[PDB]
From a paper:
The first structurally defined particle that assembles co-transcriptionally is therefore the small subunit processome, a giant precursor of the small subunit. Recent structural studies of the fully assembled SSU processome have shown that the 5’ ETS and its associated multi-protein complexes UtpA, UtpB and U3 snoRNP form a scaffold for the assembly of individual rRNA domains, thus further highlighting the central role of the 5’ ETS. Conformational switches within the 5’ ETS RNP contribute to the regulated formation of the SSU processome by inhibiting binding of late assembly factors that are associated with the compaction of the SSU processome upon completed transcription of the 18S rRNA.
Although individual rRNA domains are flexible and functionally independent modules, we observed the 5’ ETS RNP as the unifying and stable structural entity in each of these reconstructions. Multi-protein complexes UtpA and UtpB as well as the U3 snoRNP constitute the major components of this assembly. Compared with the SSU processome, the most dramatic conformational changes occur within the UtpB complex. This complex adopts a conformation that reconfigures its tetramerization module as well as the tandem β-propellers of Utp12 and Utp13 into a compacted state. As a result of this large conformational change, several binding sites for other assembly factors are disrupted, such as the bipartite binding site of the late factor Pno1, the binding sites for the C-terminal region of Mpp10, the Rcl1•Bms1 complex, several ribosomal proteins, and the 18S pre-rRNA. This density corresponds to the base of helix IX of the 5’ ETS and contains the A0 cleavage site. In the 5’ ETS RNP, an RNA linker and helix IX sterically prevent the association of the late binding factor Utp14, which binds in the same region in the SSU processome after A0 cleavage or RNA remodeling.
Residue numbers in the entry:
A (entry chain U): 1 to 120, 134 to 151, 170 to 438
B (entry chain W): 64 to 448
C (entry chain Z): 2 to 170
The structure:
RNA sequence: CAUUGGUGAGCAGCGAAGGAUUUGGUGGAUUACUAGCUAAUAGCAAUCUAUUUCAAAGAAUUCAAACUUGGGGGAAUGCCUUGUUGAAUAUUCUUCAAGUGUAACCUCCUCUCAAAUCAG
RNA sequence: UGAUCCU
């Protein structure tokens, strides 16, 4: 008649020392755990409502900024701490991302600056008055590269320490050179922007003011393809991860992301914005594209989805002219027509704090839950949502009205 | 699977000549370990009425309600006693809603929500009868079935009524909530238990469970098998997952007042002067049909696992401690905890319920549960739909 | 229960365990405080009649104005409720919905009456004196503290004879 | 002086191997006594278990079923009712209105008193 | 996510 019971033993579950933490025996038997869908669902809804409560994108600006308006932002591609901002007045201002203050500033151009680009620190400031000036960061004006075109652009090149200019004609300069090496033109028109890709660095993407996209090959000193698009194009960005696809921004409120193998079909289209998208910048992950409009608004969205998971706007910035993404995928710098370059989060709930591994494992678990509870509709109403401005909400209404009349 | 640190107690016959059910509780109290043998309580409080029993979902606090005036919340394992209320109105049931700090009693007219110290928190204008007062902490929903046809759901998180469902069945003769599913089970005089969600004004499904009135009903931890007893000296073993009564134990000597289900698979049937529990009776075969007497000692026919007869009582209700191997039987003069070997589970999960819980751990866990409450529309026939 | 966080607060927007709208602000208890009634249900024993006053007071206000039954029956209501003293005045009809409180019928309670007359120091000391068997209402010593005493019965409350607290005064 | 106040001393006086006080616990009564338990004509009381199970008997408001609500408003959203619409096979369900409709659901009341204090 | 009010 064997008699045996349960004994908690009163020492295993309640520890000896007072300073000792509790023992936590777990049984993952599903009978003990009744709600694996619903309780995880409420945790996910708590996390989504909390990320709407943790929607604080703003950090601060850089210094007090330009008075006349930021038009181009250079980022040193090794320097995660430092950055440069060019004004249409001509004042170049250099900032450190820790201090958010003016590291060094210079009276570069009495005309506009159109682009700043960095290659050996060393900054290079391209003008409207046919001049590029070489500045060093701790003093000023090492050498000025005089070209025959009013400089509609510039772009840096890391290899051979090169930089080309964008203008009426693009002509490639060196550091030691005062005259350019070779000048290229697929078509006989002024070129709005240029961009070398970062890896297999020799390839270039050249927008064309008469609705054009050319792909320039430095290895041939000749363009290798050109698609004459519908409308003119503002700016460009090559992804640092994929290194053979690039997104460009168009005159219509649409950004098109193309492939170097196939320009005849785009990789993707993006049209959350309501005006001429100024600038695009791609994550070092390769995850999300951030793009700033002629409208007083920026937007972040991932590459595969195609719609704005994130939208950025506030009172005192307008017509932003420029958005430049991180080196560390964490913060976007945002230029202004209002002259003041603000520091903004990549995600307003993602925080700078290195996290205790209780809450860090919880936060990883919660966002893993957010994805497997994604397409439920009650999750969706909190997951899409944040305040949009009055005219732009009306402008999206206008766009839906006009596209409804089109179909 | 090998992380599971504690294993169940057993009861073994060791002969065919020696019998399992013949062990008595003084005989059990010899071999059980001292704290666990002492965890059997004999609270004879003969002055007030017959006693209603409920342990909390962790065994840390016992709540009892004599029929005349008693309301008593002891910190049961220790000597501490939180509440001792003498309301001269007559009471029927009681449950802790979230913690031992807040409980609710089922009176002559109105349900009361109560502090640990015995203070009055909330008298309900509604709940004008209260026969079965049961809780589901995963919705923070006090569900109450009185002698009325209706059924009331109060969300004590907000503190508001969710809904009130008239059954057209009459006085509620039984109610058992489902732990796994949070569907409520109401039992009435036609022999009919209805499954319930607060949204659907007609029941989820009605079950013609027995003949006569429903004496009681009790549900598995897994929600698979619910053991129903009628007043027709009969007990059905419903498998809810396909809505079949597995076995129909017919012709009891007396109809069971209540039924109760342990964690590991024990079934408790209380005819009132007698309490009898079966082991593994809820399984699929009719060999696992719980039967009173197997002639010839055949392994196919199933004998009761543990027996007891109360002499001077007709007991009221019973409930296992959910993590320990006892069951509180509320008799007319009070409370016994009858020691089972393997009723409760040996390895609780602390992150579900904490039988060993600091007050600071408690106020952490309460806020954790209130964050994870479900709103009442999520009560469904499946958790996973 | 917790002085819960800024992040906890917004998720637990509507919850409370202390003051509920079905619990009607615990208003009854504030009358159970000020008049010290033994059982809770004495409040709702007044408040179940108190609406029944208004439930007749309302629909007698729905009759045509110079209905000769209406002004007569309202006078029969008001002389009755003025004999029991549950309203201070009887000239206006408007006390039948504005003055009929549980506190107004509950300040026609017996220890409130002795507490006015300053035989007792506090309210609960008069309740203790009724429990001790010291008080009487004309002929009868009353044991019950919860005595509804009319306006016209109010002169009949004395101390009971031969006591130890009537010799105290 | 009455102390009719007690302390305080005392004494007469009472007065059998102490007197006086205070309290804990338990038992007895506090209604008029026919035995305990159980499945109960019987068995038990060291035991009902390896006769307790077969057997019979055993299912209406064709859905009667808040006799239970503090009082006013309303009652959006629900429900109820019929009006009205579609579908499936003489009935449920989709759709929709009308309801000084409504114990769901929103507010107002069901607190402020010859109680006391306080300036005049 | 949204929708009210006052010059």
């Amino acid at each position: 008649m064997k008699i045996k019971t349960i004994k908690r033993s009163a020492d295993d579950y309640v520890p000896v020392k007072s300073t000792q933490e509790s023992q936590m025996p777990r049984n993952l038997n599903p009978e003990l755990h009744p709600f694996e869908r619903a309780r995880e669902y409420t945790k996910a809804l708590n996390a989504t409502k909390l990320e709407r409560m943790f929607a604080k994108p703003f950090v601060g600006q850089l210094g007090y900024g330009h008075r006349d308006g930021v038009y181009a932002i250079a980022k040193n591609y090794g320097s995660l701490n430092k950055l440069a901002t060019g004004s249409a007045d001509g004042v170049i201002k250099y900032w450190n991302m820790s201090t958010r203050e003016e590291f060094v500033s210079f009276k570069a151009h009495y005309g506009l600056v159109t682009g700043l680009c960095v290659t050996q620190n060393f900054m290079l400031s391209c003008s409207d008055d046919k001049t590029v000036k070489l500045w060093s960061i701790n003093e000023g004006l090492i050498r000025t590269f005089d070209g025959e075109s009013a400089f509609q652009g510039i772009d840096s090149h890391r290899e051979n320490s090169t930089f080309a200019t964008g203008g009426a004609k693009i002509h490639l300069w060196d550091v030691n050179r005062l005259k350019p090496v070779s000048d290229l033109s697929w078509g006989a028109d002024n070129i709005t922007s240029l961009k070398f890709n970062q890896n297999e660095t020799d390839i270039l993407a050249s927008t064309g003011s008469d609705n054009s996209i050319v792909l320039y090959d430095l290895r041939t000193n000749s363009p290798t393809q050109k698609i004459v698009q519908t409308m003119r194009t503002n700016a460009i960005c090559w992804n640092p991860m994929e290194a053979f696809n690039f997104v460009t921004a168009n005159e219509d409120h649409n950004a098109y992301y193309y492939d170097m193998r196939n320009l005849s079909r785009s990789l993707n289209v993006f049209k959350d914005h309501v005006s001429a998208v100024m600038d695009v910048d791609f994550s070092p992950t390769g995850d999300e594209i951030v793009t700033g409009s002629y409208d007083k608004s920026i937007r972040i969205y991932k590459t595969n989805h195609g719609h704005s998971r994130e939208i950025y706007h506030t009172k005192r910035m307008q017509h932003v002219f420029q958005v430049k993404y991180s080196m560390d995928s964490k913060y976007i710098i945002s230029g202004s027509d209002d002259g003041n370059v603000r520091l903004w989060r990549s995600k307003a709930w993602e925080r700078s704090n290195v996290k205790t591994t209780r809450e860090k494992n919880k936060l990883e678990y919660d966002e893993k839950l957010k994805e497997r509870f994604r397409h439920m509709p009650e999750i969706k109403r909190i997951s899409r949502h944040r305040h949009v401005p009055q005219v732009i909400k009306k402008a999206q209404e206008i766009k839906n009205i006009e596209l409804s009349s089109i179909k | 699977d090998y992380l599971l640190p504690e294993s169940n107690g057993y009861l073994e016959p060791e002969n065919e000549l020696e019998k399992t059910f013949k062990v008595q509780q003084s005989e059990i109290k010899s071999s059980v370990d001292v704290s666990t043998a002492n965890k059997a309580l004999d609270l004879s409080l003969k002055e007030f009425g017959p006693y209603h029993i409920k342990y909390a979902k962790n065994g840390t606090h016992l709540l009892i309600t004599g029929r005349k005036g008693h309301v008593a919340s002891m910190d049961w394992r220790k000597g501490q006693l939180r509440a001792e209320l003498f309301l001269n109105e007559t009471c029927h049931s009681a449950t802790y809603l979230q913690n031992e700090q807040y409980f609710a009693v089922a009176q002559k007219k109105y349900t009361f929500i109560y502090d640990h110290e015995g203070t009055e928190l909330h008298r309900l204008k509604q709940h004008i009868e209260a026969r079965h007062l049961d809780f589901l902490p995963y919705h923070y929903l006090l569900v109450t079935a009185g002698e009325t046809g209706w059924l009331k759901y109060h969300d004590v998180s907000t503190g508001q009524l969710v809904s009130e469902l008239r059954t057209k069945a009459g006085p509620t003769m039984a109610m058992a909530q489902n732990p796994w599913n949070a569907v409520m089970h109401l039992g009435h005089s036609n022999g009919t238990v209805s499954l319930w969600s607060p949204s659907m004004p007609e029941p989820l499904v009605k079950l013609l469970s027995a003949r006569g009135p429903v004496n009681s009903i009790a549900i598995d931890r897994s929600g698979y098998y619910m053991a129903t007893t009628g007043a027709d000296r009969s007990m059905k073993i419903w498998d809810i997952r396909n809505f079949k009564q597995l076995h129909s134990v017919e012709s009891l000597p007396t109809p069971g007042t209540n039924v109760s289900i342990s964690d590991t698979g024990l079934l408790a049937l209380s005819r009132g002067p007698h309490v009898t529990l079966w082991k593994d009776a809820l399984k699929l075969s009719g060999d696992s049909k719980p039967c009173f007497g197997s002639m010839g000692g055949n392994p196919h026919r199933n004998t009761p696992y543990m027996s007891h007869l109360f002499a001077g009582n007709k007991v009221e209700n019973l409930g296992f401690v959910p993590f320990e191997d006892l069951l509180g039987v509320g008799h007319q003069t009070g409370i016994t905890n009858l020691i089972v070997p393997g009723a409760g589970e040996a390895n609780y999960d602390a992150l579900e319920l904490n039988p060993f819980e600091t007050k600071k751990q408690r106020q952490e866990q309460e806020v954790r549960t209130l964050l994870n409450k479900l709103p009442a529309d999520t009560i469904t026939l499946d958790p996973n739909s | 229960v917790r002085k819960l966080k800024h992040h906890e607060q917004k998720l637990l927007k509507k919850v409370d365990f202390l003051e509920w709208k079905q619990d009607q602000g615990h208003r009854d208890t504030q009358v159970m405080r000020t008049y010290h009634i033994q059982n809770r249900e004495d409040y709702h024993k007044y408040n179940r009649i108190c609406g029944d006053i208004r439930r007749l007071a309302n629909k007698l206000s729905l009759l045509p104005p110079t209905d000769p039954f209406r002004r007569k029956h309202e006078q029969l209501l008001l002389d009755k409720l003025y004999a029991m003293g549950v309203l201070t005045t009887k000239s206006k009809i408007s006390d039948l919905e504005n003055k009929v409180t549980v506190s107004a019928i509950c300040r026609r309670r017996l220890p409130v009456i002795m507490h006015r007359l300053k035989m007792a120091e506090t309210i609960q000391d008069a309740v203790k004196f009724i429990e001790q068997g010291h008080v009487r209402v004309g002929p009868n010593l009353i044991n019950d503290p919860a005595y509804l005493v009319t306006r016209n019965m109010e002169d009949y409350v004395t101390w009971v004879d031969n006591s130890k607290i009537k010799k105290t005064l």
